[PDB]
Design a protein around this ligand. Sequence first.
Ligand SMILES: [Mg+2]
Ligand SMILES: [Mg+2]
Ligand SMILES: [Mg+2]
Ligand SMILES: [Mg+2]
Ligand SMILES: [Mg+2]
Ligand SMILES: [Mg+2]
Ligand SMILES: [Mg+2]
Ligand SMILES: [Mg+2]
Ligand SMILES: [Mg+2]
Ligand SMILES: [Mg+2]
Ligand SMILES: [Mg+2]
Ligand SMILES: [Mg+2]
Ligand SMILES: [Mg+2]
Ligand SMILES: [Mg+2]
Ligand SMILES: [Mg+2]
Ligand SMILES: [Mg+2]
Ligand SMILES: [Mg+2]
Ligand SMILES: [Mg+2]
Ligand SMILES: [Mg+2]
Ligand SMILES: [Mg+2]
Ligand SMILES: [Mg+2]
Ligand SMILES: [Mg+2]
Ligand SMILES: [Mg+2]
Ligand SMILES: [Mg+2]
Ligand SMILES: [Mg+2]
Ligand SMILES: [Mg+2]
Ligand SMILES: [Mg+2]
Ligand SMILES: [Mg+2]
Lengths: 77, 149
Amino acid sequence: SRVCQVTGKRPVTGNNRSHALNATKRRFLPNLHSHRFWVESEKRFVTLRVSAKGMRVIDKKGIDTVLAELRARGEKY
Amino acid sequence: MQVILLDKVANLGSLGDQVNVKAGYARNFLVPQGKAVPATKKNIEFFEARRAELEAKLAEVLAAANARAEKINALETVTIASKAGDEGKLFGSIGTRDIADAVTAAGVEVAKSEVRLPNGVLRTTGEHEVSFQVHSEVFAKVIVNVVAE
RNA sequence: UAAGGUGAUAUGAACCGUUAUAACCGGCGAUUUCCGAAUGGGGAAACCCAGUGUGUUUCGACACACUAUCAUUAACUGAAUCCAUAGGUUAAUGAGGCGAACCGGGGGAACUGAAACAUCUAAGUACCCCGAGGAAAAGAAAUCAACCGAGAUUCCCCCAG
RNA sequence: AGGGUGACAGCCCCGUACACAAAAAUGCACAUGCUGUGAGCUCGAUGAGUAGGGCGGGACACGUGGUAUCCUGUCUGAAUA
RNA sequence: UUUUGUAUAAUGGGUCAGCGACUUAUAUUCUGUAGCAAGGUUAACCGAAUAGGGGAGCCGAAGGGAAACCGAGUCUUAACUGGGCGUUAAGUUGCAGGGUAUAGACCCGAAACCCGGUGAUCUAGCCAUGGGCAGGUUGAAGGUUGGGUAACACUAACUGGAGGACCGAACCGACUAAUGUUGAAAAAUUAGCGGAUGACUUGUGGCUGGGGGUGAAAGGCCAAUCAAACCGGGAGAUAGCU
RNA sequence: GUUUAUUAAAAACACAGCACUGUGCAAACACGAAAGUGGACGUAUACGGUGUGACGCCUGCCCGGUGCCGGAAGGUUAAU
RNA sequence: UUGAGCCUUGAUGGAAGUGUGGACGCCAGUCUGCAUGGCUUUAAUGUUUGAUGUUCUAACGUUGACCCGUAAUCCGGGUUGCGGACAGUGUCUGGUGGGUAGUUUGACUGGGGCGGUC
RNA sequence: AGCUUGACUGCGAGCGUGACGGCGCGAGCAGGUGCGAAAGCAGGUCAUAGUGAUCCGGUGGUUCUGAAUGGAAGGGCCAUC
Ligand SMILES: [Mg+2]
Ligand SMILES: [Mg+2]
Ligand SMILES: [Mg+2]
Ligand SMILES: [Mg+2]
Ligand SMILES: [Mg+2]
Ligand SMILES: [Mg+2]
Ligand SMILES: [Mg+2]
Ligand SMILES: [Mg+2]
Ligand SMILES: [Mg+2]
Ligand SMILES: [Mg+2]
Ligand SMILES: [Mg+2]
Ligand SMILES: [Mg+2]
Ligand SMILES: [Mg+2]
Ligand SMILES: [Mg+2]
Ligand SMILES: [Mg+2]
Ligand SMILES: [Mg+2]
Ligand SMILES: [Mg+2]
Ligand SMILES: [Mg+2]
Ligand SMILES: [Mg+2]
Ligand SMILES: [Mg+2]
Ligand SMILES: [Mg+2]
Ligand SMILES: [Mg+2]
Ligand SMILES: [Mg+2]
Ligand SMILES: [Mg+2]
Ligand SMILES: [Mg+2]
Ligand SMILES: [Mg+2]
Ligand SMILES: [Mg+2]
Ligand SMILES: [Mg+2]
């Protein structure tokens, strides 16, 4: 399930449009990565599957806060 | 990705300066490994007050006994002296506890030789006012009265 | 409620009733085999096989109940690693399947029209997928207006082919 | 009104208009009790990887057009009455 | 019926009875008709419900110009002796009809395209596991022993028992002919025919699913069908043809 | 040996042999948006593709064209 | 290491004598420093800014070994080894691309085609 | 051969010829010009082929338009590719 545990980003459907302007269904899908984040708050490595941006959001909001979500949303982590 | 530092830190470190570092270095080394922290604004005052409640606070908490010599600005009672010799001149020296003898009942009592003038200690008149070790900055003033017996 | 009754083909039989427990109709209960979400394990549906508790002047054995999975919670346990996490067992709750249309969302054709055909169209239609209510969705302005003003969302008629 | 009864029925039958009825289980209203639950004033606060932008798509009757507005796969990124 | 033309030897119809094709909705214009008339008329909704309310609005009474604008005129051009389009004819709303537009638009009919399902009980290939091959020949390697060589070579008997080996039933196939061809039979019967220890043959169960499989490769096979299965759906596809 | 089950069994397919060419193993290649899997519990005396088609004697010339391999200058050249 | 900027200490804009490397030096100078003796043409650092190269580890890979969950060829955590900011993946982008897809490929014509014509 | 730019601009009674889109001929009117002493002739070439609708877009001109208002973008109009 190519889905960014932090930001909720899944894949989307769009066309390709040629020069001739030709519709060809397709998918944009997230730049996912699943990274090993250190917590200290938990002396352990929680290893989320994250989209770049999901990453940036952790770099801003703070991991302890992002894991605060999920936990509070039902997700595993 | 700015973040503020904890420990020193190679090409930027400074116990708490304000650097802007590449994302990776940080979330992958500096932080989660105790060396820095996001510049979360909440923090740039959290680690800026210390720069106030300290570098301008405890750097003022030092000044509470100016020169330490407060009301000792009129010399101190000459209980005895500090010695003499050479039938007129000087000959005797100050043991590792012999500059108190005179000012030997004023402030508080101690007994050590934090020597300050690495000379043969000039042998003449008697009463002089250099400084002595009162602290890492200030000084003090008093005199020395010999003994005629 | 009553003088008639024991559903039908479908008689007959043996009976039940006539002033209140015949029958009939309605409210509430009881019983409700097996299979089926099917849930103890299995399985070629309606069948095979268990474990744990019980229980018999004949306490062998054979009858009765519980034992699926998942989720939240709680108790007890408890690794690499000593703390701690993971893990493990038990308990209480809930979910599970089904089914008209209407609804919200996820994906999403083509024939065909263009008197060919690729932009365009058919269409966000068919169809698949998920979820829900009696409705759903939407909703109380970072909206319009136009220098006057209006004052959420939904629906209808116009504006206007 | 309508149906039936040995042919077409206001007055044979069942009905119809009308007027009535529930021990029980429920629906909805109201009046109350229980558990909750928060009410009113004053002083505040006032939704950032957000708005915006590059790129690629998609939505708007609008097929990138001179194209505002909206959603966002990717890369970025404000102000703060 | 189609045709330049059909007794035509072109089409269709065995006969009868029942059914069987120009409709409906919304617009829009015209004719007929009715009302009202420089006016006509309401929609939604309200309702005292086929009334009455509701005139939002639509059409008409004014055009010209791309337009600003002007206005029974206006545009063109600097301006027109002028020219174009207008000023001189009543409309509107019902109702019935004629046409048109949008819809399956008069009825039936394709080959096909797309979506979701159902099918390896026929068949292709593979996997596991089981079974089958009467009878009769040929007689490889190797082996023993003789002869043989200096020793090997070589050589003769015997021994042995190979082979997509031979002949031939079962079994597997299917080369020819006749029959059959409203059959016994939607692919066979009969007489002959190839393989028959193998790249053999067969039972049971398994797996591969449709632009996919499988294919010792014929476009072969995938449930009497396959240059893209079957069933449902889009669907009354479209049919300038009949 | 195989084949058009149902008008073609052949001179077609296949075949052992031969060549070319890819592949250093998490192989190339293939099924599959992926996980997973075949290749292969194999490892260049192996595995794939293409062609030829026992065996004998042999397999000449041509690299313009198409295709393929190689090329660290210049020319031209996308987002940015 | 290296292309270019800024900050600087030496070049263009406590005397005389016994003594030294580099040089556009108007063609024949004098210097630019080396010892002593009663805002614009030049060299090194601190640097700021990009390029090239080593190595590093700490993202990331591990279809090497081990530990535990776990009597388990999955997975998960853990340790160790190898690798290592490469590889790989997301968006954008140029090339390739009948492997796959939708189509197109006119009419007149003494039948059609060829030829011819439009 | 001399002088020239009538290969003009605005229009056009009235005809031809076309299903149509369109093409063609035209005296005369206004402004302005050339040649001629003058009457006068000239809105190309003796005539009849020498061509390509619409759309999109370019260029110049022009306040006609221009979504709160002033501007502008875009649009129209004239010319033209
Ligand atoms: Mg059961
Ligand atoms: Mg079961
Ligand atoms: Mg098509
Ligand atoms: Mg078409
Ligand atoms: Mg609601
Ligand atoms: Mg106001
Ligand atoms: Mg706010
Ligand atoms: Mg004829
Ligand atoms: Mg005749
Ligand atoms: Mg006939
Ligand atoms: Mg089978
Ligand atoms: Mg044989
Ligand atoms: Mg035989
Ligand atoms: Mg036979
Ligand atoms: Mg063929
Ligand atoms: Mg078949
Ligand atoms: Mg079908
Ligand atoms: Mg359709
Ligand atoms: Mg049809
Ligand atoms: Mg043969
Ligand atoms: Mg055949
Ligand atoms: Mg045959
Ligand atoms: Mg090979
Ligand atoms: Mg061949
Ligand atoms: Mg040959
Ligand atoms: Mg050759
Ligand atoms: Mg094709
Ligand atoms: Mg033709």
